[PDB]
From TrEMBL, chain B:
Signal peptide: none annotated. It comes from Meiothermus taiwanensis. The chain holds residues 99 to 147 of 719 of the full protein. Belongs to the peptidase S16 family. This is endopeptidase La.
Length: 49, 49, 97
């Protein structure tokens, strides 16, 4: 959602994610991107534990 | 014994460090960093082009 | 530069974690700082911190002095007197902590 307000679609390749839209993505939205991917990794690990 | 337990807490602080590196603020800083670097590389590449 | 960023962010975080410990164990200032230097390093280099090369070896329990520590070694061998430095064999290589 916070990507689509910025005019980007959240494309999935796996657990890794990219953004679809014109030009380079904003720094904050990319930050949120790596944030959610790292958080998903950590959440999977703590799911295991 | 108190030093031993404090060191146990400190050794656990590795997970706090990792979760800090997943936080929003640090990730925003990191993305601003590589964004400056990428735009500088783009500036060089575009001068060359 | 991002390794530097991880390092100094970790240092800023660990300073507020170590200040109460610097107050509580002023004699351990050399140790704690060293430990901190290993934590922040783990933040940048990502080397896994082994919690056996950084756990303080509390050799023997604290004594109250009443009764004092009375140690009778009827069988006095250099290991039993000065303690021995145990070792481990990893692929047959000698190492210890």
């Amino acid at each position: 959602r916070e990507a689509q307000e910025a005019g980007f679609a959240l494309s999935t390749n796996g657990e890794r994610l990219e953004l679809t839209g014109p030009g380079p993505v904003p720094a904050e939205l990319s930050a949120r991107l790596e944030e959610v991917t790292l958080g998903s990794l950590a959440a999977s690990a703590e799911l295991e534990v | 014994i108190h030093l031993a337990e404090a060191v146990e807490g400190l050794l656990l602080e590795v997970n706090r460090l990792d979760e800090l590196f997943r936080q929003g603020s640090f990730l925003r800083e990191k993305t601003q960093l590589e964004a400056r670097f990428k735009e500088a590389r783009e500036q060089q590449l575009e001068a060359l082009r | 530069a991002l390794r530097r960023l991880r390092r100094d962010w970790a240092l800023h975080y660990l300073n507020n974690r170590f200040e109460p410990l610097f107050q509580r164990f002023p004699q351990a200032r050399a140790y704690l700082e060293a430990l901190r230097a290993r934590l922040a390093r783990y933040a940048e280099t990502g080397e896994p911190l082994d919690p056996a090369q950084w756990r303080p070896n509390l050799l023997t329990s604290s004594s109250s002095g009443t009764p004092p520590p009375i140690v009778y070694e009827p069988y006095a061998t250099a290991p039993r007197l000065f303690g021995r430095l145990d070792y481990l064999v990893d692929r047959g290589v000698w190492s210890t902590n």
